Design a protein around this ligand. Structure first.
Ligand SMILES: CC(C)(COP(=O)(O)OP(=O)(O)OC[C@H]1O[C@@H](n2cnc3c(N)ncnc32)[C@H](O)[C@@H]1OP(=O)(O)O)[C@@H](O)C(=O)NCCC(=O)NCCS
Ligand SMILES: [Mg+2]
Length: 228
């Protein structure tokens, strides 16, 4: 497992953005072109180029070579490289990607004024009440702490928001109370949170507990490199 990060200490220059657009598919350039805000385009663009750069290098291929596809619920993958699993998350000045030989999920969030939504429908009565329990100055960070962890799980599973697969078992406790057991004990996942910037919350969800101690930082200059 390896985690790479790109911190946009400065936006991409006119030329840098044109150079990177050159590595992606026509469909991706259109999607990038369509964003109202250039910083959303820059995040999607860099996330795409980071994956191309990391995986192509792993298989001595050219970034341009990679061909992406989308699984059933939209999770990206590279069909011709089945064991090169990855996941991207980007928020604010951060674009981060996790790579593993098994399904992986990652999430980074710029911390900002919370909104009851997601917090009401995406947070349990439990997570929600816990949150409102935090003091006002700790609510924003706590919200994103829980959310980054929760979304890393959902992004790792890939199956969207509705565990349909035979991924759960009904367990009965005292007086017949049910507890749903998930994930299946034989399909465990683990989460590790990383402190990369105080204005952000980040979490990785992997199929094994072997998380790298550090994230490898990549610059625009390293991503633009040819490296045959
Ligand atoms: C899970 C989801 C809500 C994440 O949103 P987010 O919190 O805004 O954004 P993050 O920065 O954490 O992550 C975005 C990336 O996650 C990845 N991603 C997309 N769908 C994903 C999914 N179902 N599971 C895991 N990762 C996914 C992508 O690489 C995307 O990067 P990009 O948008 O620049 O191409 C969203 O990715 C999703 O569910 N997409 C499904 C889309 C689909 O199947 N069809 C679109 C039909 S209109
Ligand atoms: Mg997110």
């Amino acid at each position: 497992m390896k985690i790479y990060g790109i911190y946009m200490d400065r936006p991409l220059s006119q030329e840098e953005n044109e150079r990177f657009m050159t590595f992606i598919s026509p469909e991706k350039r259109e999607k990038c072109r369509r964003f109202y805000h250039k910083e959303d385009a820059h995040r999607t663009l860099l996330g795409d180029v980071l994956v191309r750069s990391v995986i192509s290098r792993q298989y001595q291929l050219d970034k341009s070579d990679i061909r992406f596809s989308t699984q059933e619920y939209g999770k990206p993958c590279i069909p011709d490289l089945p064991d090169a699993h990855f996941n991207i998350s980007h928020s604010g000045r951060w674009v981060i990607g996790a790579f593993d030989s098994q399904p992986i999920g990652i999430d980074i969030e710029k911390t900002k004024p919370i909104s009851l939504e997601i917090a009401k429908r995406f947070f349990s009565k439990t997570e929600y009440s816990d949150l409102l329990a935090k003091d006002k100055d700790e609510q924003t960070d706590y919200f994103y702490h829980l959310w980054s962890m929760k979304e890393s799980f959902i992004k790792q599973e890939g199956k969207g928001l509705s565990l349909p697969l035979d991924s759960f078992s009904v367990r009965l406790h005292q007086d017949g109370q049910v507890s749903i057991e998930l994930p299946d004990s034989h399909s465990p996942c683990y989460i590790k949170t990383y402190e990369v910037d105080p204005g952000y919350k980040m979490a990785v969800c992997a199929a094994h507990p072997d998380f790298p101690e550090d994230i490898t930082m990549v610059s625009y200059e390293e991503l633009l490199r040819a490296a045959a």
